[PDB]
């Protein structure tokens, strides 16, 4: 009863006689499966993960400038040159300035000037690549056992891992047998065309070309404590207004600009990186066995321990307490179209209440729980 | 000789007989004025300033979030409400979540949830308005005196202030008289349509509508230590992915985004705010008097104290030293089309050299400085 309370909940019933049920799990959704003489299951796709990621390119979003140097020449003395022009850490620019007697040259004319600034990246973002061969899907299965605290509890449930290599897996359901999962991980997208952009805590999924065409300084994917940046001029600007001076300034943090650019992109939790995805599976229930089919009927009384309330999908939840000593026994259930969602409701201990999910028909109907005169009669109306 | 060495230099000569010269000064430019029997002047527009500015609107570029509160209700209990919804410091959002037995409600259905976050701006930018009634133009005038250190020296020169109210002004030129400035401050742009955007040290001139349509939280121009921001949701986002949770996060610094948006805008030095502008003036030289017109000629020798060099505009600079005792005297100057830029070159002291700017004709010409056999003869060729 994990999906009881989830709005995006699907009910799937297997074909007549078949012991297999085909389901489509998607993020934020829950599917309830029913089969004749089989336990009612609540299956959910918990998370979709990428296990190991290789960084393709690394982009600088905030940088600073240090160790500025400059060299100037008088007219007709040739272009000025600095060794830092061949240092890949520095960004340099050549220009011409007005030179004459007033500024220390014998000749009047245009004199060469060159400025170099060492560039250091303060904050960067990464673009890691995801290949579907490394994707891991985690599925969670919860049996409708009637357990006391079962309704909407995300603590209990058996998890099973599906990978592109290990697509079929078996999940051991305690006291109910073994479930088969024959899933086919359909990519949903071409992963070469998409790149995982990670910035600080946050992460997104963006187009490869869009990431590569980001107007930011970039460096190879290989991590280095001292990296060599290209396109450093996309953050460093040289200004020479009136041929007197040349000042170099850095562009400032592009963090918020990236946030705006990432508005229309799919966002991903953390940077453990969990995707929002889907997965199609075939559930083999041949090895699944209903726990209390061989139990006898409960000969005593049931008492309502909680008000009957309606689910968003029209089903009702009944919490009953048994007052007899023959447990474990089968709960007598009959409607005076009316069916059960929970298959084979049973009492395990007298002290523990039982939760039953039922699908009453539209209109007035009488839910009879127990047998005989002392049976519980709950009148109910289902309005469409 | 302030413009000697400036590349953007204009030469203007007054009409025949007139004692007035019309000039157009613009930022980064220098104009040299000549008139018969009048001192040669080097006029320049130093700066254009706005004296007092009123802030129209103030926009937040970086904010943070504190004191988050939230309230939730079970289904059919009505919409949740917080008092912080009526606090203008908080940004709030209403949503609906899945509620049922599992999360503490007796009824299954959609339950109301409301979240509020107190917003605080960390960094802001201002949009101050400039009206042409407060503009101040500063003009600098430098006489061609022949002074020892006059070439390109920006230390010497008389400054005069022109304002839209005080358009005509008089500038006292020591030893040369009084200059009249009849300027007409033409706006160049409609100042209501333009707003001065100031961010940290930097400032720009942008369109009013563009500034008002900036997607940032804004507040009135009046300065307050505790301001009230509008459009706070332009920096604060609420995320509710699957009807389980609602997390509130701030957008981050928009500083670099603003820098990119301001790429095509005119930049202004500091935030003392100096514009790049122009000014048209009429120079009245009726009260200007040439210092040494009544001096006698220099009867002795001149010696070249520095190599003759050519200016970017074809003129030549001659630095001579006088070796006689009759100073002050008129320097004999003759070409063997050839004219002087510096009007009435004179020797003031024997120990101080004299700088003369001359315009030699194209081709071969002989510059004769001094009189007699002992006169200085400098051969020169001007190539076009
Ligand atoms: C770079 O310049 C600064 C100038 O303050 C100096 O401290 C530093 O030693 C220089 N070199 C390196 C490698 O930091
Ligand atoms: C949820 O399940 C755990 C596991 O048995 C149980 O201990 C807990 O009390 C339950 N709580 C609920 C349903 O609130
Ligand atoms: C806001 O919340 C914080 C919670 O840490 C608290 O310290 C503070 O006193 C609260 N109110 C104000 C006015 O800061
Ligand atoms: C510039 O002018 C000042 C003012 O007389 C003078 O003291 C200085 O030596 C000059 N320096 C130059 C032209 O380098």
Numbering used by the authors:
A (entry chain A), B (entry chain A): 1 to 271, 274 to 338, 346 to 393
Structure paper excerpt:
The human monoclonal antibody C10 exhibits extraordinary cross-reactivity, potently neutralizing Zika virus (ZIKV) and the four serotypes of dengue virus (DENV1–DENV4). Here we describe a comparative structure-function analysis of C10 bound to the envelope (E) protein dimers of the five viruses it neutralizes. The neutralizing antibodies induced during a DENV or ZIKV infection target the envelope (E) protein and, with a few exceptions, are serotype specific.
The kl hairpin adopts variable conformations, being also often disordered in structures of unbound sE, which relate to the curvature of the sE dimers in each structure.
